[PDB]
Design an enzyme around this catalytic site. Structure first.
Site, PDB file in Angstrom:
ATOM      1  N   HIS A  92      18.457 -26.118   0.602  1.00  0.00           N
ATOM      2  CA  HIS A  92      17.306 -25.279   0.942  1.00  0.00           C
ATOM      3  C   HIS A  92      16.064 -26.198   0.959  1.00  0.00           C
ATOM      4  O   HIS A  92      16.172 -27.333   0.506  1.00  0.00           O
ATOM      5  CB  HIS A  92      17.107 -24.082   0.013  1.00  0.00           C
ATOM      6  CG  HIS A  92      16.850 -24.554  -1.388  1.00  0.00           C
ATOM      7  ND1 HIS A  92      17.895 -24.805  -2.265  1.00  0.00           N
ATOM      8  CD2 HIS A  92      15.709 -24.902  -2.038  1.00  0.00           C
ATOM      9  CE1 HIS A  92      17.378 -25.257  -3.398  1.00  0.00           C
ATOM     10  NE2 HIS A  92      16.046 -25.316  -3.292  1.00  0.00           N
ATOM     11  N   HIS A  94      11.585 -26.311   0.362  1.00  0.00           N
ATOM     12  CA  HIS A  94      10.321 -25.745  -0.093  1.00  0.00           C
ATOM     13  C   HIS A  94       9.255 -26.302   0.852  1.00  0.00           C
ATOM     14  O   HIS A  94       9.344 -27.486   1.247  1.00  0.00           O
ATOM     15  CB  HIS A  94       9.990 -26.139  -1.517  1.00  0.00           C
ATOM     16  CG  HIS A  94      11.069 -25.775  -2.487  1.00  0.00           C
ATOM     17  ND1 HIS A  94      10.990 -24.666  -3.279  1.00  0.00           N
ATOM     18  CD2 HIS A  94      12.280 -26.392  -2.776  1.00  0.00           C
ATOM     19  CE1 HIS A  94      12.089 -24.592  -4.027  1.00  0.00           C
ATOM     20  NE2 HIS A  94      12.849 -25.601  -3.743  1.00  0.00           N
ATOM     21  N   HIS A 117      16.208 -29.795  -0.953  1.00  0.00           N
ATOM     22  CA  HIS A 117      17.035 -29.858  -2.143  1.00  0.00           C
ATOM     23  C   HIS A 117      18.494 -29.636  -1.787  1.00  0.00           C
ATOM     24  O   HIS A 117      18.827 -28.554  -1.303  1.00  0.00           O
ATOM     25  CB  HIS A 117      16.626 -28.810  -3.138  1.00  0.00           C
ATOM     26  CG  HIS A 117      15.297 -29.050  -3.742  1.00  0.00           C
ATOM     27  ND1 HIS A 117      14.500 -28.141  -4.361  1.00  0.00           N
ATOM     28  CD2 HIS A 117      14.657 -30.260  -3.791  1.00  0.00           C
ATOM     29  CE1 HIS A 117      13.419 -28.752  -4.799  1.00  0.00           C
ATOM     30  NE2 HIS A 117      13.475 -30.033  -4.460  1.00  0.00           N
ATOM     31  N   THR A 196      13.911 -25.156 -10.274  1.00  0.00           N
ATOM     32  CA  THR A 196      12.486 -24.921 -10.075  1.00  0.00           C
ATOM     33  C   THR A 196      12.172 -23.480  -9.707  1.00  0.00           C
ATOM     34  O   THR A 196      11.005 -23.206  -9.513  1.00  0.00           O
ATOM     35  CB  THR A 196      11.906 -25.864  -9.010  1.00  0.00           C
ATOM     36  OG1 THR A 196      12.457 -25.493  -7.754  1.00  0.00           O
ATOM     37  CG2 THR A 196      12.176 -27.340  -9.288  1.00  0.00           C
ATOM     38  N   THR A 197      13.210 -22.657  -9.612  1.00  0.00           N
ATOM     39  CA  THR A 197      12.958 -21.230  -9.495  1.00  0.00           C
ATOM     40  C   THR A 197      13.687 -20.543 -10.655  1.00  0.00           C
ATOM     41  O   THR A 197      14.628 -21.123 -11.205  1.00  0.00           O
ATOM     42  CB  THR A 197      13.427 -20.562  -8.189  1.00  0.00           C
ATOM     43  OG1 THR A 197      14.827 -20.775  -8.003  1.00  0.00           O
ATOM     44  CG2 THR A 197      12.674 -21.128  -7.016  1.00  0.00           C
TER      45      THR A 197
HETATM   46  C1  LIG Z   1      21.468 -19.297 -10.727  1.00  0.00           C
HETATM   47  C2  LIG Z   1      20.975 -18.826  -9.350  1.00  0.00           C
HETATM   48  O1  LIG Z   1      20.893 -19.971  -8.405  1.00  0.00           O
HETATM   49  C3  LIG Z   1      19.820 -20.872  -8.403  1.00  0.00           C
HETATM   50  C4  LIG Z   1      18.665 -20.423  -9.056  1.00  0.00           C
HETATM   51  C5  LIG Z   1      17.546 -21.322  -9.019  1.00  0.00           C
HETATM   52  C6  LIG Z   1      17.786 -22.530  -8.296  1.00  0.00           C
HETATM   53  N1  LIG Z   1      16.792 -23.498  -8.216  1.00  0.00           N
HETATM   54  C7  LIG Z   1      17.225 -24.525  -7.486  1.00  0.00           C
HETATM   55  S1  LIG Z   1      16.212 -25.957  -7.125  1.00  0.00           S
HETATM   56  N2  LIG Z   1      14.922 -25.423  -6.396  1.00  0.00           N
HETATM   57  O2  LIG Z   1      17.056 -26.756  -6.283  1.00  0.00           O
HETATM   58  O3  LIG Z   1      15.919 -26.511  -8.412  1.00  0.00           O
HETATM   59  S2  LIG Z   1      18.800 -24.427  -6.947  1.00  0.00           S
HETATM   60  C8  LIG Z   1      18.967 -22.945  -7.679  1.00  0.00           C
HETATM   61  C9  LIG Z   1      20.099 -22.089  -7.696  1.00  0.00           C
HETATM   62 ZN   LIG Z   2      14.659 -26.119  -4.529  1.00  0.00          ZN
END
Ligand SMILES: CCOc1ccc2nc(S(N)(=O)=O)sc2c1
Ligand SMILES: [Zn+2]
Length: 258
Positions: A92, A94, A117, A196-197
């Protein structure tokens, strides 16, 4: 009321539902290039994506994910600071409302237009859901995007975004080769961090590549036409879905190059 990037639910509010937001190993961070320690113990990355199988593209309300079949060792990341085999599950981006912002990591306080990412999980834990509960469960490859010349390997992605404009929409997305999104050099920085989410779990070995890829203004413009909202809901453009830099605290950033 749910988390997002808006004035009333953005990153400064996340801690009320996710108190690990104020944790000791949160991401992203600013990479200070002069204080990063070169580590000659670090190995080269091994990216083996020849057999990747993409399946789908999904608008999940905060970004769009390209998903891969991770039921076998198809597309794997090894080497670098990692022990063991990490399978690619999704990538994905940002991005920003303007070309001078949009990345999550920064380099000597410089922001890039977007950040890619590529998310991988440690096969020792058997499934992604188990891996996010472990301090070494995930490895995320971060790549910066700067605006300049177009990236041909990105265009297949850009062309399908019209079909997933709103939250919850998905489309078949087969035979996409993620090798087309990699820079020439695989020199990197690495540090221990977090998602980061939400849920912001502290399970990530971050691997941030030094060399940005370039994309055209027209390509990133197409990202900014996506919607956070579901169909039939008031239109909110999907822009500025980045978390600001978090304090480094008791961590050391290592570099694989000098
Ligand atoms: C557990 C639910 O799946 C998730 C939730 C947050 C999340 N953040 C990232 S990142 N922005 O690559 O750090 S990948 C990811 C997968
Ligand atoms: Zn990310």
């Amino acid at each position: 009321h749910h988390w997002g990037y808006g004035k009333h639910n953005g990153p400064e509010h996340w801690h009320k539902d996710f108190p690990i937001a104020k944790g000791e190993r949160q991401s992203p961070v600013d990479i200070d290039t002069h204080t990063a320690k070169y580590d000659p113990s670090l190995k080269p990355l091994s990216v083996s994506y020849d057999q990747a199988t993409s399946l789908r593209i999904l608008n999940n309300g905060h970004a769009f994910n390209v998903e891969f079949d991770d039921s076998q060792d198809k597309a794997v990341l090894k080497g670098g600071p990692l022990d063991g085999t990490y399978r690619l599950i999704q990538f994905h981006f940002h991005w920003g409302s303007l070309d001078g912002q949009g990345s999550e990591h920064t380099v000597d306080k410089k922001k890039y237009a977007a950040e890619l990412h590529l998310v991988h999980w440690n096969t020792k834990y058997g499934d992604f859901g188990k891996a996010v509960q472990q301090p070494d469960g995930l490895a995320v490859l971060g790549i910066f995007l700067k605006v300049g010349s177009a990236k041909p390997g990105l265009q297949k992605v850009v062309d399908v975004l019209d079909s997933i404009k709103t939250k919850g929409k998905s489309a078949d997305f087969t035979n996409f080769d993620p090798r087309g999104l990699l820079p020439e050099s695989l020199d990197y920085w690495t540090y221990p961090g977090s998602l980061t989410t939400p849920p912001l779990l502290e399970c990530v070995t971050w691997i941030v590549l030094k060399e940005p890829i370039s994309v055209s203004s027209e390509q990133v413009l197409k990202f900014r036409k996506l919607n956070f909202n579901g169909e039939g809901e008031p239109e909110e453009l999907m822009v500025d879905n980045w978390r600001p830099a978090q304090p480094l605290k008791n961590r050391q950033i290592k570099a694989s190059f000098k």
